[PDB]
Amino acid sequence: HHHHHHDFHVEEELDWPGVYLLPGQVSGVALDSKNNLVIFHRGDHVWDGNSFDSKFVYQQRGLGPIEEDTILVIDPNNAEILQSSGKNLFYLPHGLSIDTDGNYWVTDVALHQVFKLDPHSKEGPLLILGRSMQPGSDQNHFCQPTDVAVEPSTGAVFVSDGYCNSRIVQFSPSGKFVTQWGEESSGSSPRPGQFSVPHSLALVPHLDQLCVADRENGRIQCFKTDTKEFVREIKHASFGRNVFAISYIPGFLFAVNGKPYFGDQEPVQGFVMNFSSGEIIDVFKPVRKHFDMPHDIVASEDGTVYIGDAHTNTVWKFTLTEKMEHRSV
Ligand SMILES: O=C(N[C@@H](O)C(=O)O)c1ccccc1
Numbered sequence: 001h002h003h004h005h006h007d008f009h010v011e012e013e014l015d016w017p018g019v020y021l022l023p024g025q026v027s028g029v030a031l032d033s034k035n036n037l038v039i040f041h042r043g044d045h046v047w048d049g050n051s052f053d054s055k056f057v058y059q060q061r062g063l064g065p066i067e068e069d070t071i072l073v074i075d076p077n078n079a080e081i082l083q084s085s086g087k088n089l090f091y092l093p094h095g096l097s098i099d100t101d102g103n104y105w106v107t108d109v110a111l112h113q114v115f116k117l118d119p120h121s122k123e124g125p126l127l128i129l130g131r132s133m134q135p136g137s138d139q140n141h142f143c144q145p146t147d148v149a150v151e152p153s154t155g156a157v158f159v160s161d162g163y164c165n166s167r168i169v170q171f172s173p174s175g176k177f178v179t180q181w182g183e184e185s186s187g188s189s190p191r192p193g194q195f196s197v198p199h200s201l202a203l204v205p206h207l208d209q210l211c212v213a214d215r216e217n218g219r220i221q222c223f224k225t226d227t228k229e230f231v232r233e234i235k236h237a238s239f240g241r242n243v244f245a246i247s248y249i250p251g252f253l254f255a256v257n258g259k260p261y262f263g264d265q266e267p268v269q270g271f272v273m274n275f276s277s278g279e280i281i282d283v284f285k286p287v288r289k290h291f292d293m294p295h296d297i298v299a300s301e302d303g304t305v306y307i308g309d310a311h312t313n314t315v316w317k318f319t320l321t322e323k324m325e326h327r328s329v
Protein backbone atom coordinates (compact mmCIF):
# COMPACT_ATOMS: atom_id res chain seq x y z
CA HIS A 1 0.00 0.00 0.00
CA HIS A 2 0.92 3.68 0.04
CA HIS A 3 -0.18 6.73 1.82
CA HIS A 4 1.62 7.47 4.97
CA HIS A 5 -0.37 8.59 7.92
CA HIS A 6 0.18 6.00 10.67
CA ASP A 7 -1.40 2.57 10.58
CA PHE A 8 -1.90 2.75 14.34
CA HIS A 9 -5.43 3.61 15.48
CA VAL A 10 -7.22 3.72 18.82
CA GLU A 11 -10.89 2.72 18.81
CA GLU A 12 -13.50 2.53 21.58
CA GLU A 13 -14.17 -1.05 22.63
CA LEU A 14 -17.94 -1.07 22.22
CA ASP A 15 -18.69 -4.30 24.07
CA TRP A 16 -17.32 -2.88 27.35
CA PRO A 17 -20.35 -1.90 29.50
CA GLY A 18 -18.42 0.40 31.89
CA VAL A 19 -19.66 3.41 29.92
CA TYR A 20 -23.06 2.79 31.57
CA LEU A 21 -21.68 3.47 35.05
CA LEU A 22 -22.96 6.64 36.73
CA PRO A 23 -20.22 7.86 39.08
CA GLY A 24 -19.44 11.40 40.17
CA GLN A 25 -16.67 13.36 38.47
CA VAL A 26 -14.04 10.85 37.33
CA SER A 27 -10.75 12.42 38.42
CA GLY A 28 -8.34 9.45 38.24
CA VAL A 29 -7.78 6.13 36.52
CA ALA A 30 -5.21 3.36 37.03
CA LEU A 31 -4.56 -0.31 36.32
CA ASP A 32 -3.82 -2.85 39.03
CA SER A 33 -1.50 -5.88 38.73
CA LYS A 34 -4.36 -8.13 37.54
CA ASN A 35 -5.13 -5.42 34.94
CA ASN A 36 -8.43 -4.29 36.49
CA LEU A 37 -9.45 -0.69 35.95
CA VAL A 38 -9.37 1.38 39.11
CA ILE A 39 -11.22 4.72 39.12
CA PHE A 40 -11.22 7.60 41.56
CA HIS A 41 -14.36 9.74 41.52
CA ARG A 42 -15.95 12.59 43.46
CA GLY A 43 -19.39 11.09 44.20
CA ASP A 44 -21.85 13.92 44.86
CA HIS A 45 -19.04 16.47 45.21
CA VAL A 46 -18.11 18.92 42.44
CA TRP A 47 -15.18 21.31 42.10
CA ASP A 48 -17.10 24.56 41.44
CA GLY A 49 -17.15 28.34 41.99
CA ASN A 50 -17.98 27.96 45.68
CA SER A 51 -15.41 25.28 46.61
CA PHE A 52 -12.44 27.61 47.27
CA ASP A 53 -11.75 31.22 48.24
CA SER A 54 -9.03 33.71 47.21
CA LYS A 55 -6.48 31.97 49.47
CA PHE A 56 -7.24 28.41 48.21
CA VAL A 57 -8.89 27.24 51.44
CA TYR A 58 -11.83 24.83 50.96
CA GLN A 59 -15.20 26.35 51.83
CA GLN A 60 -17.55 23.36 52.02
CA ARG A 61 -16.10 21.65 55.11
CA GLY A 62 -19.40 21.64 57.06
CA LEU A 63 -20.73 19.36 54.30
CA GLY A 64 -18.39 16.56 55.42
CA PRO A 65 -16.40 14.05 53.34
CA ILE A 66 -17.83 12.10 50.38
CA GLU A 67 -19.97 9.44 52.06
CA GLU A 68 -19.96 6.85 49.26
CA ASP A 69 -17.18 4.60 47.96
CA THR A 70 -14.81 6.81 46.08
CA ILE A 71 -12.40 4.21 44.65
CA LEU A 72 -13.87 1.42 42.52
CA VAL A 73 -12.11 -1.49 40.87
CA ILE A 74 -13.80 -2.56 37.69
CA ASP A 75 -13.53 -5.73 35.61
CA PRO A 76 -11.75 -5.18 32.26
CA ASN A 77 -14.15 -7.46 30.35
CA ASN A 78 -17.68 -7.16 31.79
CA ALA A 79 -17.17 -3.91 33.73
CA GLU A 80 -18.72 -5.29 36.96
CA ILE A 81 -17.63 -3.54 40.18
CA LEU A 82 -15.19 -5.95 41.83
CA GLN A 83 -14.45 -3.83 44.92
CA SER A 84 -14.90 -0.33 46.31
CA SER A 85 -13.39 1.82 49.08
CA GLY A 86 -12.48 5.38 50.14
CA LYS A 87 -15.74 6.16 51.91
CA ASN A 88 -15.76 9.11 54.37
CA LEU A 89 -12.20 10.25 53.62
CA PHE A 90 -12.08 12.64 50.71
CA TYR A 91 -13.52 16.01 49.76
CA LEU A 92 -12.24 16.73 46.25
CA PRO A 93 -10.47 13.61 44.90
CA HIS A 94 -7.92 14.28 42.20
CA GLY A 95 -5.01 11.95 41.32
CA LEU A 96 -4.78 8.17 41.57
CA SER A 97 -1.93 5.83 40.71
CA ILE A 98 -0.95 2.33 41.78
CA ASP A 99 2.60 1.33 42.70
CA THR A 100 4.24 -2.08 42.03
CA ASP A 101 3.23 -3.36 45.50
CA GLY A 102 -0.43 -2.62 44.64
CA ASN A 103 -0.85 0.33 47.03
CA TYR A 104 -3.16 3.12 45.90
CA TRP A 105 -1.62 6.57 45.83
CA VAL A 106 -4.23 9.24 45.99
CA THR A 107 -4.47 13.03 45.93
CA ASP A 108 -7.06 15.43 47.40
CA VAL A 109 -7.29 19.04 46.21
CA ALA A 110 -9.54 20.15 49.13
CA LEU A 111 -7.49 18.48 51.88
CA HIS A 112 -4.21 19.56 50.22
CA GLN A 113 -3.00 16.03 50.94
CA VAL A 114 -1.65 12.82 49.45
CA PHE A 115 -2.62 9.40 50.83
CA LYS A 116 -1.07 5.97 50.40
CA LEU A 117 -3.69 3.20 50.76
CA ASP A 118 -3.60 -0.56 51.23
CA PRO A 119 -6.59 -1.73 49.10
CA HIS A 120 -7.26 -4.71 51.44
CA SER A 121 -7.02 -2.86 54.76
CA LYS A 122 -9.92 -1.68 56.93
CA GLU A 123 -7.58 0.40 59.12
CA GLY A 124 -7.06 3.54 57.03
CA PRO A 125 -4.14 5.16 55.15
CA LEU A 126 -0.57 3.87 55.51
CA LEU A 127 0.85 7.34 54.92
CA ILE A 128 -0.64 10.81 54.76
CA LEU A 129 1.39 13.63 53.20
CA GLY A 130 0.48 17.28 53.81
CA ARG A 131 -1.56 19.21 56.37
CA SER A 132 -5.34 18.68 56.56
CA MET A 133 -7.18 21.45 54.64
CA GLN A 134 -4.10 23.71 55.00
CA PRO A 135 -2.48 25.00 51.76
CA GLY A 136 1.21 25.94 51.65
CA SER A 137 4.50 26.04 49.76
CA ASP A 138 7.14 24.61 52.12
CA GLN A 139 8.33 21.01 52.70
CA ASN A 140 5.31 19.90 54.79
CA HIS A 141 2.52 21.50 52.73
CA PHE A 142 0.82 21.14 49.35
CA CYS A 143 -1.41 23.52 47.38
CA GLN A 144 -4.11 21.66 45.45
CA PRO A 145 -1.85 18.61 44.68
CA THR A 146 -2.72 16.82 41.45
CA ASP A 147 -0.89 13.52 40.85
CA VAL A 148 1.49 10.94 42.32
CA ALA A 149 4.05 8.67 40.66
CA VAL A 150 6.02 6.01 42.54
CA GLU A 151 9.26 4.62 41.07
CA PRO A 152 9.35 0.77 41.29
CA SER A 153 13.16 0.47 41.52
CA THR A 154 13.82 3.01 44.30
CA GLY A 155 10.42 3.49 45.92
CA ALA A 156 10.76 7.25 45.40
CA VAL A 157 7.43 9.10 45.56
CA PHE A 158 6.82 12.01 43.19
CA VAL A 159 3.98 14.47 43.74
CA SER A 160 2.99 17.15 41.23
CA ASP A 161 1.93 20.07 43.42
CA GLY A 162 -0.06 21.83 40.86
CA TYR A 163 -3.15 24.01 40.88
CA CYS A 164 -1.65 26.71 43.14
CA ASN A 165 2.04 25.70 43.26
CA SER A 166 4.56 25.06 40.47
CA ARG A 167 6.71 22.15 41.74
CA ILE A 168 7.38 18.41 41.69
CA VAL A 169 8.25 17.12 45.15
CA GLN A 170 10.17 13.94 45.90
CA PHE A 171 9.54 11.97 49.09
CA SER A 172 11.14 8.98 50.80
CA PRO A 173 9.13 5.73 51.07
CA SER A 174 8.62 6.79 54.71
CA GLY A 175 7.29 10.17 53.52
CA LYS A 176 10.28 12.42 54.25
CA PHE A 177 10.85 15.39 51.92
CA VAL A 178 13.93 14.71 49.80
CA THR A 179 14.05 17.33 47.04
CA GLN A 180 11.86 19.49 44.80
CA TRP A 181 12.06 21.13 41.37
CA GLY A 182 10.15 23.53 39.13
CA GLU A 183 8.97 27.14 39.17
CA GLU A 184 6.16 29.20 37.59
CA SER A 185 6.32 29.63 33.81
CA SER A 186 7.64 33.19 33.55
CA GLY A 187 6.33 36.09 31.43
CA SER A 188 6.70 35.94 27.66
CA SER A 189 7.31 32.33 26.51
CA PRO A 190 7.30 29.47 29.10
CA ARG A 191 10.81 28.05 29.60
CA PRO A 192 12.27 24.56 30.37
CA GLY A 193 11.64 23.60 34.01
CA GLN A 194 8.73 26.01 34.46
CA PHE A 195 5.20 24.73 35.08
CA SER A 196 1.76 26.24 34.83
CA VAL A 197 -0.33 23.66 36.71
CA PRO A 198 1.65 20.41 36.72
CA HIS A 199 -1.31 18.13 36.39
CA SER A 200 -0.26 14.56 35.48
CA LEU A 201 2.80 12.35 35.88
CA ALA A 202 4.08 9.42 33.84
CA LEU A 203 7.15 7.44 34.89
CA VAL A 204 9.35 5.93 32.22
CA PRO A 205 10.80 2.95 34.19
CA HIS A 206 13.74 1.89 32.01
CA LEU A 207 14.86 5.23 30.58
CA ASP A 208 14.99 6.87 34.03
CA GLN A 209 12.47 9.56 33.06
CA LEU A 210 9.56 11.42 34.59
CA CYS A 211 7.11 13.20 32.29
CA VAL A 212 4.84 16.03 33.42
CA ALA A 213 1.70 17.29 31.72
CA ASP A 214 2.02 21.07 31.99
CA ARG A 215 -1.70 21.83 31.89
CA GLU A 216 -2.00 25.60 31.25
CA ASN A 217 1.01 25.62 28.87
CA GLY A 218 -0.30 22.89 26.56
CA ARG A 219 2.95 20.94 26.76
CA ILE A 220 4.65 17.84 28.20
CA GLN A 221 7.96 18.13 30.08
CA CYS A 222 10.32 15.20 30.68
CA PHE A 223 13.06 15.05 33.31
CA LYS A 224 15.82 12.64 34.31
CA THR A 225 14.49 10.81 37.35
CA ASP A 226 17.75 11.04 39.34
CA THR A 227 19.43 14.32 38.38
CA LYS A 228 16.23 16.26 37.61
CA GLU A 229 17.84 17.37 34.35
CA PHE A 230 15.36 18.67 31.78
CA VAL A 231 15.43 16.07 29.00
CA ARG A 232 12.87 17.17 26.47
CA GLU A 233 9.70 19.12 25.73
CA ILE A 234 6.76 17.78 23.73
CA LYS A 235 4.45 20.46 22.32
CA HIS A 236 2.12 20.39 19.31
CA ALA A 237 -0.34 22.85 17.80
CA SER A 238 -2.89 19.98 17.83
CA PHE A 239 -2.85 20.00 21.66
CA GLY A 240 -4.39 23.46 21.78
CA ARG A 241 -4.21 25.30 25.10
CA ASN A 242 -4.08 22.34 27.50
CA VAL A 243 -2.63 18.91 28.21
CA PHE A 244 -4.73 17.28 30.92
CA ALA A 245 -3.19 13.81 31.27
CA ILE A 246 -0.45 11.50 30.01
CA SER A 247 0.30 7.80 30.31
CA TYR A 248 3.28 5.81 29.08
CA ILE A 249 3.66 2.28 27.75
CA PRO A 250 6.85 1.10 26.00
CA GLY A 251 6.88 2.77 22.58
CA PHE A 252 4.02 5.19 23.26
CA LEU A 253 2.97 8.31 25.08
CA PHE A 254 -0.79 8.74 25.39
CA ALA A 255 -2.22 12.17 26.12
CA VAL A 256 -5.50 13.96 26.51
CA ASN A 257 -6.10 17.68 25.91
CA GLY A 258 -8.58 20.36 26.99
CA LYS A 259 -11.95 21.40 25.59
CA PRO A 260 -11.45 24.29 23.11
CA TYR A 261 -12.43 27.91 23.84
CA PHE A 262 -14.94 29.53 21.51
CA GLY A 263 -12.91 30.20 18.33
CA ASP A 264 -10.26 27.49 18.73
CA GLN A 265 -9.61 25.09 15.86
CA GLU A 266 -8.48 22.12 18.04
CA PRO A 267 -11.13 19.64 19.26
CA VAL A 268 -10.90 17.68 22.55
CA GLN A 269 -9.18 14.39 21.76
CA GLY A 270 -6.98 11.53 22.88
CA PHE A 271 -3.49 11.52 21.35
CA VAL A 272 -1.06 8.69 20.69
CA MET A 273 2.59 9.62 20.26
CA ASN A 274 5.68 7.72 19.25
CA PHE A 275 7.57 8.11 22.53
CA SER A 276 10.96 8.40 20.85
CA SER A 277 10.21 11.09 18.24
CA GLY A 278 7.38 12.75 20.18
CA GLU A 279 5.22 12.85 17.05
CA ILE A 280 1.45 12.37 17.13
CA ILE A 281 0.65 9.25 15.12
CA ASP A 282 -3.02 8.97 16.02
CA VAL A 283 -5.89 11.03 17.35
CA PHE A 284 -9.10 9.50 18.76
CA LYS A 285 -12.46 10.02 20.48
CA PRO A 286 -15.31 7.82 21.84
CA VAL A 287 -18.31 6.56 19.87
CA ARG A 288 -20.53 6.51 22.96
CA LYS A 289 -21.20 9.81 24.69
CA HIS A 290 -18.56 12.56 24.40
CA PHE A 291 -15.41 14.11 25.80
CA ASP A 292 -15.93 17.30 27.79
CA MET A 293 -13.13 17.21 30.33
CA PRO A 294 -11.20 14.01 29.72
CA HIS A 295 -9.16 14.09 32.88
CA ASP A 296 -6.93 11.03 33.27
CA ILE A 297 -5.68 8.30 30.97
CA VAL A 298 -3.96 4.91 31.55
CA ALA A 299 -2.66 2.42 29.05
CA SER A 300 -1.70 -1.22 29.27
CA GLU A 301 0.93 -3.21 27.37
CA ASP A 302 -1.91 -5.39 26.06
CA GLY A 303 -3.03 -2.33 24.09
CA THR A 304 -5.88 -1.17 26.28
CA VAL A 305 -6.41 2.54 27.03
CA TYR A 306 -8.88 3.93 29.62
CA ILE A 307 -9.98 7.57 29.92
CA GLY A 308 -12.10 9.21 32.65
CA ASP A 309 -14.03 12.46 32.23
CA ALA A 310 -14.60 14.94 35.06
CA HIS A 311 -17.54 16.76 33.41
CA THR A 312 -19.42 13.89 31.74
CA ASN A 313 -18.79 11.50 34.64
CA THR A 314 -17.92 8.65 32.29
CA VAL A 315 -15.05 6.25 31.80
CA TRP A 316 -14.23 4.68 28.43
CA LYS A 317 -12.16 1.73 27.27
CA PHE A 318 -10.26 1.89 23.96
CA THR A 319 -7.88 -0.51 22.22
CA LEU A 320 -4.72 0.31 20.27
CA THR A 321 -4.39 -1.46 16.92
CA GLU A 322 -2.33 -1.49 13.73
CA LYS A 323 -4.34 -2.25 10.58
CA MET A 324 -3.19 -2.78 7.01
CA GLU A 325 -5.93 -0.27 6.14
CA HIS A 326 -7.18 1.95 8.98
CA ARG A 327 -10.88 1.32 9.54
CA SER A 328 -12.52 3.30 6.68
CA VAL A 329 -9.11 4.72 5.53
O1 LIG B 1 -10.14 22.70 35.74
C1 LIG B 1 -10.36 22.77 36.94
N1 LIG B 1 -10.66 21.71 37.68
C2 LIG B 1 -10.55 20.35 37.17
O2 LIG B 1 -9.18 20.07 36.89
C3 LIG B 1 -11.14 19.31 38.09
O3 LIG B 1 -12.38 19.14 38.07
O4 LIG B 1 -10.39 18.64 38.83
C4 LIG B 1 -10.28 24.12 37.60
C5 LIG B 1 -11.14 25.13 37.21
C6 LIG B 1 -11.07 26.39 37.81
C7 LIG B 1 -10.13 26.62 38.82
C8 LIG B 1 -9.26 25.60 39.21
C9 LIG B 1 -9.33 24.35 38.60
Ligand SMILES: [Ca+2]
Pocket residue numbers: 028029030095096097296297298
Ligand atom coordinates in the same frame (compact mmCIF):
# COMPACT_ATOMS: atom_id res chain seq x y z
CA1 LIG C 1 -3.57 7.77 37.05
Ligand SMILES: [Hg+2]
Pocket residue numbers: 001002003004005006007
Ligand atom coordinates in the same frame (compact mmCIF):
# COMPACT_ATOMS: atom_id res chain seq x y z
HG1 LIG D 1 1.40 2.47 6.07
Ligand SMILES: [Hg+2]
Pocket residue numbers: 094199295
Ligand atom coordinates in the same frame (compact mmCIF):
# COMPACT_ATOMS: atom_id res chain seq x y z
HG1 LIG E 1 -7.75 18.25 37.55
